[PDB]
Enzyme design. Sequence first.
Site, PDB file in Angstrom:
ATOM      1  CB  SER A 203     -22.029  49.748  36.616  1.00 31.92           C
ATOM      2  OG  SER A 203     -23.281  49.889  36.002  1.00 31.92           O
ATOM      3  CD  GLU A 330     -24.710  44.594  41.978  1.00 29.73           C
ATOM      4  OE1 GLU A 330     -24.917  45.719  41.483  1.00 29.73           O
ATOM      5  OE2 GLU A 330     -23.551  44.175  42.240  1.00 29.73           O
ATOM      6  CG  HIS A 443     -25.122  49.345  40.631  1.00 25.73           C
ATOM      7  ND1 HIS A 443     -24.668  48.089  40.288  1.00 25.73           N
ATOM      8  CD2 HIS A 443     -25.012  50.106  39.515  1.00 25.73           C
ATOM      9  CE1 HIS A 443     -24.277  48.099  39.024  1.00 25.73           C
ATOM     10  NE2 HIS A 443     -24.481  49.308  38.532  1.00 25.73           N
TER      11      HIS A 443
HETATM   12  N1  LIG Z   1     -37.281  63.565  34.209  1.00 24.73           N
HETATM   13  C1  LIG Z   1     -36.165  62.927  33.678  1.00 24.73           C
HETATM   14  C2  LIG Z   1     -35.454  63.434  32.533  1.00 24.73           C
HETATM   15  C3  LIG Z   1     -34.342  62.751  32.053  1.00 24.73           C
HETATM   16  C4  LIG Z   1     -33.825  61.524  32.630  1.00 24.73           C
HETATM   17  C5  LIG Z   1     -34.531  61.031  33.786  1.00 24.73           C
HETATM   18  C6  LIG Z   1     -35.700  61.756  34.255  1.00 24.73           C
HETATM   19  C7  LIG Z   1     -34.144  59.794  34.416  1.00 24.73           C
HETATM   20  C8  LIG Z   1     -34.973  59.441  35.637  1.00 24.73           C
HETATM   21  C9  LIG Z   1     -34.697  60.117  36.846  1.00 24.73           C
HETATM   22  C10 LIG Z   1     -35.478  59.849  37.971  1.00 24.73           C
HETATM   23  C11 LIG Z   1     -36.528  58.923  37.880  1.00 24.73           C
HETATM   24  C12 LIG Z   1     -36.825  58.254  36.683  1.00 24.73           C
HETATM   25  C13 LIG Z   1     -36.050  58.523  35.557  1.00 24.73           C
HETATM   26  N2  LIG Z   1     -33.114  59.056  33.895  1.00 24.73           N
HETATM   27  C14 LIG Z   1     -32.826  57.774  34.617  1.00 24.73           C
HETATM   28  C15 LIG Z   1     -31.519  56.982  34.446  1.00 24.73           C
HETATM   29  C16 LIG Z   1     -31.276  55.868  35.490  1.00 24.73           C
HETATM   30  C17 LIG Z   1     -30.404  56.297  36.677  1.00 24.73           C
HETATM   31  C18 LIG Z   1     -30.072  55.094  37.568  1.00 24.73           C
HETATM   32  C19 LIG Z   1     -28.791  55.223  38.410  1.00 24.73           C
HETATM   33  C20 LIG Z   1     -27.529  54.934  37.630  1.00 24.73           C
HETATM   34  C21 LIG Z   1     -27.036  53.679  37.256  1.00 24.73           C
HETATM   35  N3  LIG Z   1     -25.904  53.752  36.543  1.00 24.73           N
HETATM   36  N4  LIG Z   1     -25.640  55.032  36.456  1.00 24.73           N
HETATM   37  N5  LIG Z   1     -26.581  55.738  37.092  1.00 24.73           N
HETATM   38  C22 LIG Z   1     -26.676  57.187  37.216  1.00 24.73           C
HETATM   39  C23 LIG Z   1     -26.287  57.698  38.596  1.00 24.73           C
HETATM   40  N6  LIG Z   1     -24.906  57.362  38.969  1.00 24.73           N
HETATM   41  C24 LIG Z   1     -24.716  56.268  39.814  1.00 24.73           C
HETATM   42  C25 LIG Z   1     -23.652  55.395  39.420  1.00 24.73           C
HETATM   43  C26 LIG Z   1     -23.452  54.203  40.189  1.00 24.73           C
HETATM   44  N7  LIG Z   1     -24.181  53.942  41.316  1.00 24.73           N
HETATM   45  C27 LIG Z   1     -25.182  54.759  41.706  1.00 24.73           C
HETATM   46  C28 LIG Z   1     -25.909  54.424  42.893  1.00 24.73           C
HETATM   47  C29 LIG Z   1     -26.866  55.267  43.403  1.00 24.73           C
HETATM   48  C30 LIG Z   1     -27.182  56.480  42.740  1.00 24.73           C
HETATM   49  C31 LIG Z   1     -26.503  56.809  41.598  1.00 24.73           C
HETATM   50  C32 LIG Z   1     -25.481  55.959  41.003  1.00 24.73           C
HETATM   51  C33 LIG Z   1     -22.385  53.275  39.810  1.00 24.73           C
HETATM   52  C34 LIG Z   1     -21.740  53.441  38.612  1.00 24.73           C
HETATM   53  C35 LIG Z   1     -21.668  54.759  38.050  1.00 24.73           C
HETATM   54  C36 LIG Z   1     -22.686  55.668  38.347  1.00 24.73           C
HETATM   55  C37 LIG Z   1     -32.387  59.452  32.717  1.00 24.73           C
HETATM   56  C38 LIG Z   1     -31.626  58.534  31.913  1.00 24.73           C
HETATM   57  C39 LIG Z   1     -31.128  58.821  30.633  1.00 24.73           C
HETATM   58  N8  LIG Z   1     -30.402  57.859  29.967  1.00 24.73           N
HETATM   59  C40 LIG Z   1     -31.399  60.095  30.057  1.00 24.73           C
HETATM   60  C41 LIG Z   1     -32.147  61.005  30.769  1.00 24.73           C
HETATM   61  C42 LIG Z   1     -32.706  60.729  32.088  1.00 24.73           C
END
Ligand SMILES: Nc1ccc2c(c1)c(-c1ccccc1)[n+](CCCCCCc1cnnn1CCNc1c3c(nc4ccccc14)CCCC3)c1cc(N)ccc21
Lengths: 537, 534
Positions: A203, A330, A443
């Site tokens: 990623s 993905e 992912h």
């Molecule tokens: N109310 C609030 C306040 C602050 C933030 C919030 C919401 C959200 C959010 C949460 C829920 C719904 C909508 C938005 N995001 C969303 C970021 C997108 C997360 C997507 C998942 C992802 C993708 N790459 N890294 N990650 C983070 C989680 N770690 C994972 C990772 C990976 N795979 C997965 C698969 C499933 C779940 C988690 C996960 C693979 C690689 C490394 C991390 C944030 C993103 C930011 N950059 C800052 C703040 C916040």
Amino acid sequence: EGREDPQLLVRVRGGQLRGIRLKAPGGPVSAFLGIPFAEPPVGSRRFMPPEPKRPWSGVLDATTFQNVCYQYVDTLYPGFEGTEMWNPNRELSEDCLYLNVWTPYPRPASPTPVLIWIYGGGFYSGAASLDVYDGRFLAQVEGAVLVSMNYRVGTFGFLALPGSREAPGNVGLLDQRLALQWVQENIAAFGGDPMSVTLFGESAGAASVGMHILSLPSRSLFHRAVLQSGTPNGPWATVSAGEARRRATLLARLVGCPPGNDTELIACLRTRPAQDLVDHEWHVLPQESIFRFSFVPVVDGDFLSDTPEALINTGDFQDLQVLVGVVKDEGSAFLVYGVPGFSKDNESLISRAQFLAGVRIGVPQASDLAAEAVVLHYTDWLHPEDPTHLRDAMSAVVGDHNVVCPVAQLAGRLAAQGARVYAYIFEHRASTLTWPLWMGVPHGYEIEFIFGLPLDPSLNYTTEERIFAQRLMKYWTNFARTGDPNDPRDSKSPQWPPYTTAAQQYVSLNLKPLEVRRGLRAQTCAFWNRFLPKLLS
Amino acid sequence: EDPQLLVRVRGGQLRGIRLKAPGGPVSAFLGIPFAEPPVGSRRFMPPEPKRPWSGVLDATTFQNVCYQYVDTLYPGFEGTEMWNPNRELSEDCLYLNVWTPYPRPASPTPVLIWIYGGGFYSGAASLDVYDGRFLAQVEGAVLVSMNYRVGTFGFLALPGSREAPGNVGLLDQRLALQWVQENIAAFGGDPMSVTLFGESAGAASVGMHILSLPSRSLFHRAVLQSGTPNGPWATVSAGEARRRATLLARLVGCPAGGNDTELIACLRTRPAQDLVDHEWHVLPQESIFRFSFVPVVDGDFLSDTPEALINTGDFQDLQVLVGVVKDEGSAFLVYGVPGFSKDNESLISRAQFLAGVRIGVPQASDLAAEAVVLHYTDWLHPEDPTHLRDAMSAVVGDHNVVCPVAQLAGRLAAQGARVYAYIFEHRASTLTWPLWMGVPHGYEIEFIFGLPLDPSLNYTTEERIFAQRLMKYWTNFARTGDPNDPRDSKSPQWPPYTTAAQQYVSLNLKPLEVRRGLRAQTCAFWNRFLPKLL
Ligand SMILES: Nc1ccc2c(c1)c(-c1ccccc1)[n+](CCCCCCc1cnnn1CCNc1c3c(nc4ccccc14)CCCC3)c1cc(N)ccc21
Ligand SMILES: Nc1ccc2c(c1)c(-c1ccccc1)[n+](CCCCCCc1cnnn1CCNc1c3c(nc4ccccc14)CCCC3)c1cc(N)ccc21
């Protein structure tokens, strides 16, 4: 002393380290955890490039994981292993520039190939200390020296006022380059071959690996690269100078640092508690969206002399060897983080309205015409209202747009320009997965297999998965060793052929032996890579 | 004198000829006049009804072919000549033909009316492939075909004018239809069971009778084979027809203008061949599957565009049979697309493919043209000539026939009609066109008409049985509005085409197979996306 295990005392260039002897299933490994490679990037050093770690005195204890870089902790599903497994497992601090080295016990007589892992996490989260990045298995089983680093994520790593001295952007890449430099200098002390360093990451980390491929001053510090489920090119791994300028300024304003030169502003940001920057990070994005992240590599005309797509189009990759690939699903995970209608706790059968709405969030940079083009492409005109297909199409859009087609463009351009590319699709859902069935192989969920976790019998993976994990580690480390994931001896197993423009070959990774396939979503990626751009007007 | 070959129609007495069909004799009444010959001052004008005649009119032979462009692409090549005029050409051509059983049917028989195609610039009811003999004899049907005016003579329009109002070819057809209401009973046909059927341009003509209220009382059911009133080639705007009429007039010395009346007066002073000489020179672009003089959206015969009409029409008590052949676009390629020919496998380059699309979708902008290319390239074998050739063919067939057919089928079905859809996939063994052309535009007709039943034409046993199957579907359709054999209680049923299920059937040597969705993804491209590139 005197009394300690002689295998655990190593001198690197900053001074002496004491490591720890760890149990792996097949026997012991050495670990040197929390070696510091940079000056703690705190105070006046926030937003600033890393500075090499000044030598210490005495024997530095290197027996435990050091701090995790300051970051947003996921609270989407409280207590849910599926999300919690990615969250920090050590204290959050700005003082986090540390790395880790696993090696065989005893350390090998002759130099060993070195894998360097770069974690993912949307350039905003991530930590080399997470269970799924545990290098003990690769070390014990394949005799590999494995290194993972912490690098600054989020504002701390990527907030940029391009052109400025005080916040030039890309400092998270710079932290990684420094861990890379440190390996060149010191890995030999642990029996690693500095002349055989393979970068790998998934990623955002995969995106990172690609950026090192694309940045001259990093090309000397590694020989081979592996990009899992991510690329430097694509809609999310970089922003332009102006857009980074806009985001930094907006954040600055949000935390009470009104913009009128850059020094005053960056100075003000530096006075702000780290938790305040994290609390406001999400608010600078230009549209409601998924698979977009606020602070990411900026095309600064420095680290990145041009956009990634410009550099893959014109770069000379006369022998570079890369292994690239994707998981089956993905997009699926992203949908629970924002897209209405979707959840882990039910089937996520969505309506056509929810789908059109999802495509807007899923392709935020796209006009009305283009979003309607995506929808027309992904509609099954035979059952255009079918909740299950709509759901899976939403997943495919996010997946294809952000990962699969960027990966396809990457392979294609590299191969066309000298590189030996090996391409894969990973299709095995873990038996131990906590996410629901509908999400497929989300992912990030090949990582636990590449790293060998199923070999830990206390983790409850099936025997099949343990054999599979072993196969995977062999591909990865053969590739590290030789540039080729095949075994030069095992002629009976089916061969994994290179990816080429003439034949677009890639393999399935599942419980069955290797199956060769042609064209990585060829038709749909023609849509995203060739057509959708041209909807530029 | 054979009483069976003697009929009194409203205009007078007619003498037929007894013709030999495989299974027995049929009665033919060929070259019956249905209109005052539309010559001299009547050129470009609506047809007037045929004045009554004295004594017994000789209706034993086909009459003249309406004046038309004769194809000189491959001289004397069967594949092309079989479409060329097989009688003398003449502006005096408003004649129809009737095939009926011998003896005359005891009770009123369903009537099936053929309207040839030929791109509204050619064709004739006298062509070997439209021989009513077999359907008459075998199925007991009364079969009727007309000549109607084509090219300038049938479709030159200066819209809004009194002396060249356009659509007269369609009016010629409407008059033949009226003639059938008035006279067919005299031959044993049931005027209360008339089925229009036609192919290509004839198919679009049928479609136009569907969408034109004054035609609707003259027929009860319809069959559109490889053609539609909607779509890129079957109509033009009033402004567009005016432009070509005017341009044609300029090209022949007429009169500039100044005054419609004056312009038409001059056109009427020109020998037919002079009009045909410059017919081809009025097209806006280099193109294929575009035709110079075609029906015009006059706001009279056609109250709106076919698109508008099918979208908002009420088609409650209508039964329609629609379909396409496997390779609609192939033939058209040899008519002007560089790199294509019948005399080699036609393995084109990529450049040729991109140049072919410009020609193939003449109206298309740079972006729309690229959308097409990117849609039709096989990204796995991007530069494979076999793939490019087949793709070029697909483009043309899809754009002009299959997706128009798909769109019509869906609108009709959504809006009350009862629709049955087919794809015709059998390549006739007798075909003189090369293999790569597949089942070309117009080579299902042959079968529907029962030609393989004549043993002298050397079709295979398989093909005779296939032809027999087909005549049963069509005439079952004419009889009942349902192509299914209400006797055979032993599957596999042809289901109605619906928007929901999109069911249609393969017509080939193997028994009916039911497929769903007629190029659903590709036609979404053509019918939904591509308009949005305006
Ligand atoms: N109310 C609030 C306040 C602050 C933030 C919030 C919401 C959200 C959010 C949460 C829920 C719904 C909508 C938005 N995001 C969303 C970021 C997108 C997360 C997507 C998942 C992802 C993708 N790459 N890294 N990650 C983070 C989680 N770690 C994972 C990772 C990976 N795979 C997965 C698969 C499933 C779940 C988690 C996960 C693979 C690689 C490394 C991390 C944030 C993103 C930011 N950059 C800052 C703040 C916040
Ligand atoms: N130098 C000149 C001067 C005048 C004309 C010329 C060329 C050409 C031309 C010929 C070769 C290459 C490029 C253009 N066309 C274009 C012909 C367009 C028609 C192509 C095929 C077609 C489609 N519908 N009817 N036809 C005419 C041939 N009749 C067929 C028909 C059908 N099927 C087939 C199948 C294969 C071959 C022919 C054929 C089925 C339905 C009825 C007729 C004309 C078209 C005009 N409207 C007027 C004049 C001329």
